[PDB]
């Protein structure tokens, strides 16, 4: 069917503080990416273990179409397993069931364009379990909204407000942090990739997942015009997180 | 008087294209701030012409309390004039009437204590007119949400997502751009200031407006935890822009 919107806080998927979060993020391997494309442990869709995500948020709120509260299970069409992939023991473990999704590809301004690919999956956990992500030297990025002058010329018009990447940090970082889920709770997992080379698909639902590339162009300079169809995807904010029944999401 | 939320696009206040905008911003005078605290032309509240804003967005959508749409004039209590201040001819011109507002002070929780003051005013234009802002070498900033590792140590927990300033640019910039309003249309004006020294008030409503400071600390390093009462103010996003009847907004301090 049609899209529905999430209302409520987005929380870290971790027991102590369940603290709110205000951005989706993406973990970048800058340790072993030269050897071969980075393929690590994490949350993965169905049997496509190459599409690993380290960004999962708990959703304790509710979902609406217009003024009406809706149940993502009732609105669902397709479903598939949301799994944990462990590269150390090569074990794929079912975490829950996907009921909604969204996907988007954002292209930069101007010639020689760059793509951000984003896929979001709304799923309900059916086990209570925890895991740590893998250890490797990393960067981290999220999409930000940037006000900037209109031209290189000194004299600006009304400032542009466009997307850019916050890409951190110069110091060394490892993101081997803990996630914990509770059976029955609702989560969103974000697969976000800057400048990917390859995608994998859940062909039955025409649902894309970009893979982490071995190499990528400068992430600092590019700018993305913010389009109406990028709203709700998680890319530029967590505002108005929007999901579609699986198989009914927009094409990429 | 409870709060209501705006649903719809925020558009540049300019008559060519009315293009959507996705952040509020603040113009910073880095030309003449040493000689005197910068006091330029712009949108000002009532008779407090020192509180000039260059960020006004048109709101063509609707306002809601829950599922019910509301008319901000009907929900209103306090009102005051929203004016244009022209430093060249020293003329204060009434643009419209304020019907709703919001205000907030974001305070850092690190060693260096830093405040961002934000005030928003929802007003209905009563004339159709336009103006340009003043010419001075300037900076520009908006609040951004930044994902970052948890400590200075190598090993991070679940990334923090905090507020920081996008503060641009190294090259020369002037923001003498045009704003244009149409009578009957709804607008929000944002007064946002980093590290202010002074505030002015509409005492009848205990509504604060920070003034542009003569000097300020480094804007790049500070980070602000994003609090629930910062949501809806325009500071970190234009998501769920929230307004209160004038005089019923949250206390500033
Ligand atoms: K690439
Ligand atoms: K100051």
Best CA proximity match to A239, nearest among A248, A226, A225: A226
How distant, in Å, are the alpha carbons of A166, A228, B27, B235 from that of A225?
Answer: 16, 10, 22, 20
Q: Residues of A66-87 as b/e, b for ≥16 C-beta within 10 angstroms?
A: eeeebebeebbebbbbbbbbbe
d(CA A250, CA B49): 49
* B157 → chain A, closest CA residue: A177
Burial class (CB in 10 A: 0-12, 13-18, 19+), B88: exposed
Interface of B with A (CB under 8 A): 12-14, 20-23, 25, 67, 140-142, 144-149, 152, 154-159, 161, 166, 168-169, 171-179, 226, 228, 236-237, 239-240
Q: Output the six-digit token pair for A137.
A: 């030297």
How distant, in Å, are the alpha carbons of A8, A82, A125, A181, B120 from that of A57?
Answer: 12, 14, 12, 10, 31
d(CA A116, CA A224): 9
| Cβ contact, residue pair A166, B146, below 8 Å | yes
Instruction: Tell me, in Å, the resolution of the deposited structure.
Output: 1.8
Q: Output the six-digit token pair for B234.
A: 């325009």
- How close, in Å, is residue A204 to chain B by CA atoms? 33
Q: Output the six-digit token pair for B146.
A: 């930044």
d(CA B88, CA A129): 67
Q: Output the six-digit token pair for B114.
A: 């830093």
- How close, in Å, is residue B204 to chain A by CA atoms? 33
How is residue A251 annotated by DSSP?
P
Contacts of B155 (CB under 8 A, 6+ apart): A174, A176
Q: DSSP secondary structure string, A18-77?
A: --B-----EEEE-SSTTTS----SEEEETT-TTS-B-EEEE--SEEEETTEEE-HHHH--
d(CA B107, CA B213): 17
Best CA proximity match to B85, nearest among B31, B40, B33: B40
- For residue B38, the CA-to-ligand 2 centroid distance in Å is 12
How is residue B229 annotated by DSSP?
G
A-chain CB neighbours of B176 within 8 Å are 155
A-chain CB neighbours of B145 within 8 Å are 22-23, 142, 144, 237
3-state secondary structure of B45: strand
Burial class (CB in 10 A: 0-12, 13-18, 19+), A55: buried
| Cβ contact, residue pair B239, A237, below 8 Å | yes
Interface of A with B (CB under 8 A): 12-14, 20-23, 25, 67, 140-142, 144-149, 152, 154-159, 161, 166, 168-169, 171-179, 226, 236-237, 239-240
How distant, in Å, are the alpha carbons of A7, A136, A140, B59 from that of A118?
Answer: 20, 23, 15, 29
Q: Are B234 and B241 in contact (CB under 8 A)?
A: yes
d(CA B141, CA B129): 26
d(CA B210, CA A27): 39
How is the beta sheet containing B26-29 ordered, strand by strand?
A: B26-29, B138-148, B160-168
Q: Output the six-digit token pair for A210.
A: 């970009």
Task: Choose the closest CB to A23 out of B147, B157, B176.
Answer: B147
- For residue A214, the CA-to-ligand 1 centroid distance in Å is 7
Contacts of B228 (CB under 8 A, 6+ apart): A20
The dihedrals phi and psi of A230, each to the nearest 5 degrees, come to -85, -15
Number of Cβ within a 10 Å radius of residue B59: 24
Alpha-carbon torsion (B58, B45, B36, B163), positive or negative = negative
d(CA A73, CA A28): 33
Cis? peptide before A169, omega within 30° of 0: yes
**Own/partner pairs, A225-232, CB within 8 angstroms, 24+ separation:** A225/A109, A225/A162, A225/A163, A226/A145, A226/A161, A226/A162, A226/A163, A226/B20, A226/B22, A227/A106, A229/A104, A230/A104, A230/A106, A230/A163, A232/A3, A232/A5, A232/A102
Number of Cβ within a 10 Å radius of residue A134: 21
Task: Choose the closest CB to A177 out of B145, B158, B175.
Answer: B158
Integer-rounded Cα Rg, in Å, for chain B is: 18
Q: Output the six-digit token pair for B131.
A: 């103006």
Residue of A18, A147, A166, A192 for testing the chain B interface, max B β-carbons within 10 Å: A147
A-chain CB neighbours of B144 within 8 Å are 144-146, 166
- Interface A–B counts its CB contacts (< 8 A) at 125
Identify the nearest ligand to the CA of A211 by its number. Answer: 1
How distant, in Å, are the alpha carbons of A245, B28, B51, B76, B203 from that of B48?
Answer: 52, 19, 6, 21, 11
How distant, in Å, are the alpha carbons of B26, B123, B191 from that of B181?
Answer: 19, 11, 18
Burial class (CB in 10 A: 0-12, 13-18, 19+), B223: middle
A240 φ/ψ sector (left φ>0, alpha ψ -120 to 50, else beta)? left
- How close, in Å, is residue B147 to chain A by CA atoms? 6
Cis? peptide before A158, omega within 30° of 0: no
How is residue B73 annotated by DSSP?
H
Nearby residues for ligand 1 (ion, Cβ within 5 Å): A 195, 197, 213, 216
H/E run at residue B74: helix B72-75
Task: Choose the closest CB to B21 out of A141, A161, A178.
Answer: A161
How is residue B152 annotated by DSSP?
S
- For residue B217, the CA-to-ligand 2 centroid distance in Å is 7
Q: Output the six-digit token pair for B86.
A: 């022209």
Q: Are B99 and B74 in contact (CB under 8 A)?
A: no
Best CA proximity match to B195, nearest among B224, B173, B218: B218
- For residue A147, the CA-to-ligand 1 centroid distance in Å is 27
Number of Cβ within a 10 Å radius of residue B71: 11
Contacts of A64 (CB under 8 A, 6+ apart): A4, A5, A7, A70
* A177 → chain B, closest CA residue: B157
d(CA A128, CA B144): 34
3-state secondary structure of B194: strand
A-chain CB neighbours of B159 within 8 Å are 25, 140, 175
Q: Are A41 and A85 in contact (CB under 8 A)?
A: yes
- For residue B212, the CA-to-ligand 2 centroid distance in Å is 9
Q: How many residues are given for chain B?
A: 253
Please name every residue paired with A70 in a beta bridge, in sequence order, or none if there are none: A63
């Amino acid at each position: 069917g049609d899209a529905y919107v999430y209302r409520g806080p987005c929380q870290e998927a971790a027991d102590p503080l369940h603290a709110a979060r205000y951005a989706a993020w993406s973990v970048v391997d800058v340790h072993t990416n030269h050897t071969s494309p980075p393929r690590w442990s994490g949350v993965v869709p169905d049997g496509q273990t190459s599409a690993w995500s380290a960004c999962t948020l708990e959703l304790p709120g509710a979902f609406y179409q217009g003024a009406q509260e809706i149940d993502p299970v009732a609105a669902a069409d397709g479903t598939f397993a949301v799994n944990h992939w462990n590269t150390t023991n090569q074990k794929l473990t079912r975490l829950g069931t996907a009921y909604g999704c969204n996907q988007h590809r954002a292209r930069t301004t101007g010639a020689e364009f760059r793509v951000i690919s984003v896929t979001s999956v709304l799923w309900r956990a059916e086990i209570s379990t925890g895991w740590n992500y893998d250890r490797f030297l990393a960067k981290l990025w999220n999409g930000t909204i940037l006000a900037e002058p209109t031209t290189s010329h000194q004299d600006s018009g009304i400032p542009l407000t466009r997307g850019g990447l916050n890409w951190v940090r110069s110091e060394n970082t490892v993101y081997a942090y803990r996630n914990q889920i509770t059976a029955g709770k609702w989560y969103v997992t974000f697969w976000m990739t800057y400048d990917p080379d390859e995608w994998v698909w859940l062909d039955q639902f025409k649902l894309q997942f970009a893979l982490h590339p071995a190499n990528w162009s400068d992430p600092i300079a590019p700018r993305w015009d913010i389009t109406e169809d990028s709203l709700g995807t998680g890319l530029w904010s967590l505002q108005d997180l929007t999901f579609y029944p699986v198989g009914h999401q927009p094409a990429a």
